[PDB]
Design an enzyme around this catalytic site. Structure first.
Site, short mmCIF file in Angstrom:
data_model
loop_
_atom_site.label_atom_id
_atom_site.label_comp_id
_atom_site.label_asym_id
_atom_site.label_seq_id
_atom_site.Cartn_x
_atom_site.Cartn_y
_atom_site.Cartn_z
N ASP D 41 5.46 76.01 -17.44
CA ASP D 41 6.76 75.37 -17.56
C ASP D 41 7.48 75.84 -18.82
O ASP D 41 8.62 76.30 -18.76
CB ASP D 41 6.57 73.84 -17.59
CG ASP D 41 7.88 73.07 -17.59
OD1 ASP D 41 8.96 73.69 -17.45
OD2 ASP D 41 7.83 71.83 -17.74
N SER D 42 6.80 75.79 -19.96
CA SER D 42 7.31 76.41 -21.16
C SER D 42 6.56 77.70 -21.44
O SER D 42 5.75 78.16 -20.64
CB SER D 42 7.20 75.47 -22.36
OG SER D 42 5.84 75.22 -22.67
#
Ligand SMILES: CCCCCCCCCCCCCCCCCC(=O)OC[C@H](COP(=O)([O-])OCC(O)COP(=O)([O-])OC[C@@H](COC(=O)CCCCCCCCCCCCCCCCC)OC(=O)CCCCCCCCCCCCCCCCC)OC(=O)CCCCCCCCCCCCCCCCC
Ligand SMILES: CCCCCCCCCCCCCCCCCC(=O)OC[C@H](COP(=O)([O-])OCC(O)COP(=O)([O-])OC[C@@H](COC(=O)CCCCCCCCCCCCCCCCC)OC(=O)CCCCCCCCCCCCCCCCC)OC(=O)CCCCCCCCCCCCCCCCC
Ligand SMILES: CCCCCCCCCCCCCCCCCC(=O)OC[C@H](COP(=O)(O)OCCN)OC(=O)CCCCCCCCCCCCCCCCC
Lengths: 114, 458, 84, 86, 68, 107, 51, 57, 167, 173, 252, 141
Positions: D41-42
């Site tokens: 996600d990051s």
């Protein structure tokens, strides 16, 4: 000093029921651009927040005013006050300077001006 | 003399007598010509002043002051033309008549030979001005400006006629200023204060002290189309000079009570300019300049000791132009955008490039760059009023600061990017926009070359 | 007010007349032709006359015996001077 | 005055993205959809714009992060910022 | 080749102006200009001394200058 | 400040010198140290604190300076010896903290 | 070399920088346009003249 | 457009004009030659030395 | 802002203020993974209060260690020569007041302009009225259907679509 | 020019030359050059008109008034007789301004004429100058009535204080 | 009208309203010593005051020392220079080198003959200008811009000038500016090819080393930026060097 | 030519929900804490009902902030509250409320005492008592 200015605070998750704070504004920027895009206009827009910006500021106070609260009788501490002071400062001078101009000569004799 | 009143009254049926639309150019053409007559026999002495008739010495006095008064007339019809083209000719014939009907008395006054022609002609206006304010206003708040403009000006100028008829039969005859060669003084009593106070306060209510100016922005904020009579009402005010004819004499020796008119207007001079910074309406913003460095003359006049009259005269006609011309800008920029709200007009200076240098030279003469008349009219104030007492350097030294932030904030508000929504503002200042805006900065700075023509006798 | 006419004041013609009647009457006949007048206009407030006559008269006294800038109260013993 | 085109931006972006040994330089360049190379996600989306700022260097706005799904989308609007191809 | 399109609001109404000054402001300027030199060349202020002038000198025209 | 008597002419900025202005002087060495001629001192253009010692000497310095105009150097030995007049003076005036030191101590 | 080429003196968060700011330009320019513009005007403004 | 006269660099370290640096280097002498006369002839101080005013006699 | 992406706005700036502190280009690079280590220490766990201490204590230790005069990326929300060039700003629609003999120039360009208007001359009848169909009552962010369902002309024409360039 | 004794100045004292040296002086390649590009377009034209101006000679005279009107006459209330008694007094206050101007510039000629001494020379101007203005504002300066100039009504009533006080009330005199 | 070159740029035109705010205070002094001479000496001529000397200069002069500090960027009025750099580069080259910053300490020089007396005068001067230095120096370090550091460099060049008026050193003060001005025009104008030809940065970060196609300009730095360091044999060898070795023997 | 009820009327409580928002929406729900309340310390006619005040302070901050315009340029339709000090004011600095300047401005005030002394170089301090003698002490010759 002036100010924190609170770039972080409490949140999460309360007041997530608060929505349509944007629906208030999103209505207008839809309507405003619905105003602002048209072929034939050639003229300024009403923009009421400005009409209610001056007219609720310049006029519409002495109508709203009441001479009651002694925080509105405050101004004697502001308006008249220092105007007495400037008399107290001057009137001592123009005299202290005057007394010497009679007995004793402070100036020189090459002062013609004045 | 009749060299003047007669052609300028001869103007009067140069107008209606004419045809259709030729009217404007008809009278603007002639109205300029009279300016040759204006100088013509004037700017004689000099020493041992000119008096050419029994009841007129036009202006000798070294208060020439009359040449301007004859300027501003055919600066109006170039000024006033904008939205006055939208109603009928028999009314348009009127508005040019009463406007002249003003110009005829301002030639009568400033001469007057005496006190008692002054007064009845000092009050002889307010018939022509009041009619221009109430009709051809814009807002509906105008109707109150009609009253407030009276009920002050007339309110306390009646105590003149109680006093000036009191002098006429007391000492000789007031029929002539040029004979004061007998004047006894005024020593003291509880009667004489009033005499001095009656012969004064009528004048103050025109050039405002920081009290009883409550009318001045009421009439200017809302006032005719072009500033059409707003240029004239910035002549009317300064014409309170006559205090120069009195207070020089005719109770010379009471300075005793001067102080409540010094410290009252001397702390307002540092004041009302500062209540002018947050204004949101532009024709207000200029209206409070007009108090400020006008109200500096009232501390120039009361003090005796010339080097004030050297500097007090240059001021009456100093802002006589600069303070005139600004009302001419804020008019134009209002033609195109119909709010007078200062905020709304921004992002100019791209779209009207030539009118850039017009704002600048205006807002630069409140700054008073050294060479122009403005400072050489202020720095004879400070030189005598310093000798009064050394401490005057502070407050009136502060005046020279807040006024600089004052002016710029008006220009620099019109340097920004704004494209924003305006489809208006196309007209790139058709000549009259920049023609009538000239005939100010050209004649103004010019005088600095030979500035002995603006000075008192001292 | 632009149907692609050029225009200044009002309409087709005398507008063109109305520009020459301001520019030409307004200046070049006044701000110039007139401005010339006071430029070299004669001696203003009799000072020109004064320089020389407040020049000549300096040495006249300085030459023979006399002082300079007396202020003797304009020949006293013309005045009886009330004492009390 | 410096000449700018639409080729280099397809190259440069292809370039350093092919420089990272975390990506094999057989992988798609113009369209991978980046969700195959979004992991996780990051540390991808804000991770990839950490380097790409080091060459052009304007600000990489925040809300333009979610346009970064399409590898043709990142290069897409960088043309509109610096006044790029006709 | 590499090229763009300049943008200016109008130059014409400003250039159509400045002429009516610069053209006219000279138009009576230059004729007034010779008369400030030529009129001084052949004619100038002289001199002094003195004069008793008999009974009385003339009226005004005591000045020292071409036009004064 | 040797002779403290009056001044016939009152011209200050001491156009009335005591006789010639010294720095202090004498007191003993040198009782009369001797400088230059005053009639020529201010007859030329000579600034104050150019009226100290070595007036005779430095008046010559500028003489040659005015001689060769398109030149950057006149005498670097004189300007050196200008210390040898001045340094010798100044060091002779370094002696006033020597005497007062041991003179104002015990006796 | 002790700034850059050194032994990695870390971004140790604690120091005194009143140094790089000068700290005078920080508050006063937040103050002089407050204590005056909004005090001796908003009083003097339509707050008073209209009352 | 204007011209190609020099192309930019991808950090291949662009070349000089070869009259760029030499014409400059002759002004690396004007500091190193004009520094000649410092110690010749002048010392750290050209003064004369205060001889400790011993004669308090 | 949705709780998920709240670290990004920190994760964007975290290393940002770092680099203006480091000097050597490797220094930034050498501390990358080393300071990158701290993020995934707890990689997968609760979204709520359990890991809110990854948000909670992130406040301090950041603001502490802040303002070493960061590198501002000159053309941007702040810092020198960002908004610098306004002397053009491209006042689109400067084409109105001309008095031709000023219009002799760019004839091909005057031809092109009046060809753009036909779209905006009438695109409306279905352009505006669809916005009366599209947004039922109080609609949030106001763009039309992305195509406008057949041909958008522009539809956002032309203020956003023709807008002003930079030079 | 002017009147010598109205504007006296000390003489020239031209400095002596001191070549002393074997080196070229550039001024002699300029004063010998500059002179030749000046005199021709310059001096010929001034000579050109000054003869061109021989064709006509005007006159403007030296204006001198007629002084009968005296000072302290006449009978008090009068107008005609006291209209003029200022015209005597007003002009004679426009003179006494300028005589301070002339005497002031003469002072400047004590400085940049010399300026190195500034002290041991001139013997005169300053020690005189402050003996001049002290003969000015007394009795010739109506102050603080200078705004009205108070001509002849206050002009004597300093000088009544300069009579009714001095020379008698001085105690004892 | 120069700092305000670029419109928009909400900092640019608010760097003007600074310049004309702080000068106008610094104005308020020099109109005081314009008044004092009339009421006492009845002229303002620089010749006449020096011929006829004033006794008490205490008030008339302190006014001048205030107008000195307006344009000479002294302490307490200083915050204006670092934000006076927001305009075009050759501007600040001209504004800050030989002009506009020199008048503050220039004007006081012109007054040497009268100011030599009255220790009050001399006292506040060197009790002022010296302090300007270390608030500028201590504010220089850590600063990130080419232009800014070159702004403070000339800010602290002032402290030495104004000190030299404090001890009575009329000429040796002014020789400084004659020499100094040759530096910082070069020094700035050097940075032009650094800022422009790098397309821009004017940050001291992201610079690099001495030689990448900058052979000549980098010789201009290390000459001048050596010269300003105390002048070993170079230009201002008679400027900064002849001060702390001369007036340093005094009542300091 | 806005007809009826242009601006604030006699508040600041005339049915708080009637105002915001009848027109002039300062608050949405009549409680945003933007309700036309902030008539703090009334009897001063200043700021009547006013779809208005104490909404917070220190700036419009003029950054990306880009729904459309949102701050000082581009004019969102109607929020306006109070203004005109907003073009000469910004937000939070790095430190907080440290006056070390009055410290440093008084830092030299320590050296006021350094003023009462002199700096005379020659000779040294040499602790003395009655050795000082600026000019002379004992006899002249
Ligand atoms: C009189 C005082 C002159 C000195 C102050 C003016 C400075 C020069 C100037 O006007 O700059 C205009 C220039 C215009 O800027 P712009 O808005 O980008 O130009 C828009 C248009 O082009 C319109 O602006 P512009 O720049 O094109 O100005 C028009 C000007 C431009 O063409 C010029 O000839 C240049 C004029 C400069 C000297 C003017 C005469 C100097 C005597 O054309 C003319 O001069 C017309 C001929 C007038 C002849 C007058 C003869 C005597 C009557 O700058 C200014 O607006 C400010 C001027 C004031 C400067 C500060 C003054 C105090 C110091
Ligand atoms: C196409 C070529 C064909 C051939 C042409 C002929 C040859 C060329 C023309 C002749 C040359 C004229 C030059 C005039 C300037 C220099 C005059 C001079 O320095 O010597 C004094 C010379 C006479 O010397 P003088 O006879 O021995 O003095 C007798 C008095 O004692 C005088 O003492 P004062 O008490 O009267 O004081 C004089 C003082 C004071 O007079 C004033 O100027 C003040 C004016 C303020 C008026 C106030 C009222 C405003 C309402 O004057 C000034 O301040 C200097 C201002 C420069 C001229 C004034 C322009 C005014 C418009 O000229 C004058 O004093 C009178 C001038 C009157 C104004 C003339 C205006 C002419 C305009 C023509 C413009 C030419 C167009 C240029 C084209 C290029 C544009 C880019
Ligand atoms: C207030 C009203 C009070 C006035 C007191 C009476 C005025 C008066 O007595 O005048 C004094 C004097 C004339 O009376 P008297 O002393 O007998 O003269 C000697 C004659 N051998 O000398 C005079 O003739 C003075 C007469 C003129 C004074 C009239 C004006 C007095 C009040 C003016 C107020 C100023 C403005 C205030 C009003 C504006 C607002 C309404």
């Amino acid at each position: 000093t002036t100010l924190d200015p609170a770039e972080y605070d409490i949140s999460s998750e309360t007041r997530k029921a608060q929505a349509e704070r944007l629906a208030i504004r999103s209505r207008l920027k839809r309507e405003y651009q619905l105003q602002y895009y048209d072929p034939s206009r050639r003229g300024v827009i009403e923009d009421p927040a400005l009409v209610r910006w001056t007219y609720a500021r310049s006029a519409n106070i002495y109508p709203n005013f009441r001479p009651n609260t002694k925080t509105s009788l405050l101004g004697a501490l502001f308006g008249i006050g220092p105007l007495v002071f400037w008399y107290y400062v001057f009137k001592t001078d123009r005299d202290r300077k005057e007394k010497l101009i009679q007995e004793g000569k402070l100036d020189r004799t090459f002062n013609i001006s004045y | 003399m009749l060299k003047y009143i007669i052609p300028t009254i001869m103007l009067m049926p140069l107008t209606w007598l004419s045809k259709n639309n030729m009217i404007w150019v008809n009278s603007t053409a002639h109205s300029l010509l009279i300016s040759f007559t204006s100088l013509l026999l004037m700017n004689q002495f000099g020493d041992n002043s000119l008096n050419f008739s029994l009841l007129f010495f036009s202006d000798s006095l070294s208060t020439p002051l009359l040449i301007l008064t004859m300027w501003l007339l055919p600066l109006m019809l170039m000024a006033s033309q904008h939205h006055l083209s939208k109603e009928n000719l028999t009314r348009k014939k009127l508005f040019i008549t009463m406007l002249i009907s003003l110009q005829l008395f301002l030639i009568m006054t400033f001469t007057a030979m005496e006190l008692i022609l002054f007064y009845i002609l000092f009050e002889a206006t307010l018939v022509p001005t009041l009619i221009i304010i109430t009709r051809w206003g814009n807002q509906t708040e105008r109707l109150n400006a009609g009253l407030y403009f009276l009920f002050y000006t007339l309110a306390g100028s009646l105590p003149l006629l109680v006093a000036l008829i009191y002098i006429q039969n007391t000492v000789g005859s007031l029929n002539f200023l040029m004979l004061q060669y007998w004047v006894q003084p005024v020593h003291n009593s509880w009667s004489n204060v009033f005499m001095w106070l009656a012969c004064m306060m009528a004048f103050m209510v025109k050039m405002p002290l920081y009290g009883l100016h409550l009318w001045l922005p009421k009439a200017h904020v809302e006032a005719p189309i072009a500033g059409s009579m707003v240029l004239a009402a910035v002549l009317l005010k300064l014409g309170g000079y006559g205090m120069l004819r009195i207070t020089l004499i005719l109770n010379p020796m009471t300075d005793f009570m001067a102080y409540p008119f010094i410290m009252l207007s001397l702390w307002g001079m540092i004041m009302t300019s500062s209540i002018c910074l947050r204004q949101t309406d532009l024709k207000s913003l200029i209206a409070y300049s007009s108090v400020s460095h006008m109200a500096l003359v009232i501390v120039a006049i009361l003090i005796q000791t010339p080097w004030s009259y050297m500097g007090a005269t240059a001021l009456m006609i100093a802002h006589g132009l600069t303070s005139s011309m600004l009302f001419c800008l804020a008019n134009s920029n209002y033609e195109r955008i119909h709010s007078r709200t200062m905020i709304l007009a921004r992002g100019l200076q791209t779209l009207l490039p030539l009118m850039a240098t017009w704002w600048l030279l205006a807002s630069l003469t409140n700054l008073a760059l050294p060479p122009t008349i403005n400072l050489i009219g202020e720095l004879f104030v400070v030189m005598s009023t310093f000798s009064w007492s050394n401490i005057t350097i502070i407050l009136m030294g502060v005046n020279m600061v807040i006024t600089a932030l004052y002016s710029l904030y008006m220009l620099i508000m019109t340097q920004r990017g704004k494209y924003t929504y305006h489809i208006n503002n196309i007209s790139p200042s058709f000549t009259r926009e920049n023609a009538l805006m000239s005939l100010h900065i050209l004649p103004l700075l010019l005088l600095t070359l030979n500035p002995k023509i603006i000075l008192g006798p001292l | 007010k632009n149907p692609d006419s050029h225009g200044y004041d009002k309409d087709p013609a005398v507008d063109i007349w109305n520009m020459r009647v301001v520019f030409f009457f307004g200046f070049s006949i006044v701000l110039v032709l007139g401005s010339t007048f006071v430029a070299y206009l004669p001696d203003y407030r009799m000072q020109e006359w004064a320089r020389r006559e407040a020049e000549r008269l300096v040495k006249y006294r300085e030459a023979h015996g006399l002082p300079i800038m007396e202020s003797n109260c304009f020949d006293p013993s013309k005045i009886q001077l009330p004492e009390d | 005055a410096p000449p700018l085109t639409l080729e280099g931006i397809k190259d440069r972006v292809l370039y350093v993205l092919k420089l990272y040994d975390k990506i094999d330089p057989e992988k798609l360049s113009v369209n991978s959809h980046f969700m195959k190379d979004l992991g996780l996600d990051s540390l991808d989306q804000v991770e990839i714009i950490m380097a790409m700022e080091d060459e052009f260097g304007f600000e990489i706005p925040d809300i333009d992060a979610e346009k970064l799904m399409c590898p043709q989308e990142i290069v897409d609007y960088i043309a509109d910022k610096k006044d790029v191809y006709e | 080749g590499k090229r763009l399109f300049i943008i200016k609001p109008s130059g014409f109404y400003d250039k159509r102006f400045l002429k009516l000054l610069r053209f006219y402001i000279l138009l009576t300027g230059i004729p007034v200009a010779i008369g400030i030199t030529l009129i001084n060349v052949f004619i100038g202020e002289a001199e002094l001394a003195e004069i008793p002038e008999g009974y009385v000198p003339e009226h005004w025209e005591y000045f020292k200058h071409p036009i004064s | 400040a040797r002779r403290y008597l009056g001044d016939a002419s009152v011209e200050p900025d001491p156009l009335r010198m005591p006789t010639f202005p010294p720095d202090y002087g004498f007191p003993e060495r040198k009782e009369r140290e001797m400088v230059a001629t005053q009639q020529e001192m201010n007859d030329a253009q000579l600034v104050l604190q150019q009226r100290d010692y070595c007036a005779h000497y430095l008046i010559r310095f500028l003489k040659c300076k005015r001689d060769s105009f398109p030149n950057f150097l006149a005498c670097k030995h004189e300007r050196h010896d200008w210390d040898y007049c001045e340094h010798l003076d100044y060091v002779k005036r370094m002696k006033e903290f020597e005497r007062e030191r041991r003179l104002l101590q015990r006796k | 070399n002790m700034t850059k080429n050194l032994k990695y003196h870390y971004p140790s968060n604690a120091f005194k920088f009143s140094t790089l700011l000068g700290y005078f330009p920080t508050i006063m320019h937040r103050l002089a346009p407050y204590m005056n513009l909004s005090m001796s005007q908003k009083s003097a403004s339509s707050l008073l003249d209209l009352i | 457009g204007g011209g190609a006269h020099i192309e930019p660099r991808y950090r291949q370290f662009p070349q000089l004009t070869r009259s760029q640096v030499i014409q400059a280097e002759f002004f690396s002498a004007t500091m190193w030659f004009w520094i000649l006369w410092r110690f010749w002839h002048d010392s750290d101080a050209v003064l004369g030395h205060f001889p400790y005013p011993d004669p308090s006699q | 802002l949705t709780h998920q992406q709240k670290v990004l706005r920190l994760y964007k700036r975290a290393l940002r203020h770092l680099e203006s502190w480091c000097i050597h280009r490797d220094k930034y690079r050498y501390f990358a993974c080393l300071l990158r280590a701290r993020f995934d220490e707890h990689k997968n766990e609760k979204d709520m209060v359990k890991a809110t201490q990854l948000l909670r204590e992130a406040e301090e230790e950041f603001w502490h260690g802040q303002h070493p005069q960061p590198y501002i990326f000159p053309e941007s929300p702040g810092g020198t020569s960002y908004e610098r060039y306004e002397c053009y700003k491209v006042p689109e629609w400067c084409l109105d007041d001309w008095h031709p003999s000023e219009k002799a120039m760019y004839p091909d360009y005057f031809a092109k302009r009046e060809q753009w208007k036909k779209l905006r001359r009438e695109s409306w009848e279905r352009e505006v009225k669809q916005l009366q169909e599209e947004t039922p009552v109080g609609g949030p962010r106001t763009e039309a259907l992305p195509p406008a369902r057949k041909q958008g002309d522009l539809p956002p024409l032309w203020w956003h679509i023709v807008t002003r360039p930079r030079e | 020019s002017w009147d010598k004794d109205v504007y006296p100045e000390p003489p020239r004292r031209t400095p002596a030359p001191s070549p002393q040296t074997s080196l070229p002086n550039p001024i002699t390649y300029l004063t010998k050059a500059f002179d030749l590009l000046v005199d021709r377009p310059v001096t010929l034209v001034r000579e050109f008109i000054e003869r061109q101006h021989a064709k006509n000679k005007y006159y403007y005279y030296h204006r001198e008034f007629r002084r009968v009107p005296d000072i302290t006459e006449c009978q008090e209330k009068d107008v005609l007789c006291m209209f003029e008694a200022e015209m005597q007094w007003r002009r004679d206050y426009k003179v006494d301004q300028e005589i301070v101007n002339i005497i002031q510039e003469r002072l400047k000629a004590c400085q940049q004429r010399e300026g190195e001494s500034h002290r041991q020379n001139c013997a005169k101007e300053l020690e005189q100058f402050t003996q001049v203005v002290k003969a000015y504002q007394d009795r010739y300066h109506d102050l603080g009535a200078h705004y009205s100039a108070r001509k002849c009504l206050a002009k004597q009533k300093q000088r009544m204080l300069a009579e009714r006080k001095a020379a008698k009330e001085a105690a004892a005199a | 009208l120069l700092i305000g070159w670029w419109y928009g740029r909400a900092d640019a035109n608010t760097a003007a309203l600074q310049a004309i705010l702080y000068n106008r205070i610094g104005d308020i002094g020099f109109i005081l010593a314009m008044a004092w001479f009339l009421t006492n000496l009845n002229t303002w001529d620089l010749q006449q005051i020096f011929m006829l000397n004033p006794s008490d200069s205490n008030m008339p002069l302190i006014g001048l020392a205030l107008a000195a500090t307006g344009k000479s960027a002294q302490f307490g009025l200083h915050p204006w220079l670092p934000s006076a750099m927001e305009g075009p580069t050759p501007v600040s080259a001209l504004l800050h080198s030989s002009t506009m910053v020199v008048a503050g300490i220039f004007l006081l020089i012109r007054f040497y003959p009268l100011t030599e007396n009255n220790k009050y005068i001399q006292s506040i001067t060197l009790c002022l200008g010296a302090i300007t230095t270390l608030f500028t120096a201590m504010c220089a370090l850590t600063q990130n811009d080419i232009k800014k550091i070159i702004a403070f460099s000339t800010s602290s060049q002032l402290g030495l000038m104004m000190v030299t008026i404090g001890i009575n050193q009329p000429y040796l003060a002014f020789l400084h500016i004659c020499t100094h001005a040759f530096f910082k025009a070069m020094l700035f104008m050097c940075s032009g090819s650094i800022i422009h030809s790098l397309n821009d940065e004017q940050d001291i970060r992201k610079m690099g080393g001495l030689f990448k196609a900058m052979p000549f300009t980098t010789t201009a730095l290390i000459v001048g930026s050596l010269a300003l360091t105390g002048m070993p044999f170079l230009t201002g060898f008679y400027s900064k060097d002849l001060i702390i070795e001369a007036a340093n023997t005094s009542y300091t | 030519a806005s007809h009826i009820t242009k601006d604030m009327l006699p508040g600041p409580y005339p049915k708080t929900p009637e105002e915001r928002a009848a027109a002039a929406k300062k608050y949405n729900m009549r409680v945003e804490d933007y309700e036309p309340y902030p008539d703090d310390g009334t009897g001063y006619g200043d700021y009547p009902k006013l779809p208005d005040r104490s909404q917070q302070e220190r700036d419009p901050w003029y950054d990306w902030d880009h729904p459309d315009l949102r701050l000082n340029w581009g004019e969102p339709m109607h929020w306006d509250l109070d203004m005109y000090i907003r073009n000469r004011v910004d937000t939070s600095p790095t430190p907080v409320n440290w006056n070390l300047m009055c410290k440093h401005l008084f830092g030299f005030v320590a050296f006021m005492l350094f003023m009462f002394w002199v700096g005379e170089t020659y000779p040294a301090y040499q602790p003395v008592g009655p050795k000082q003698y600026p000019y002379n002490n004992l006899y002249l010759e």
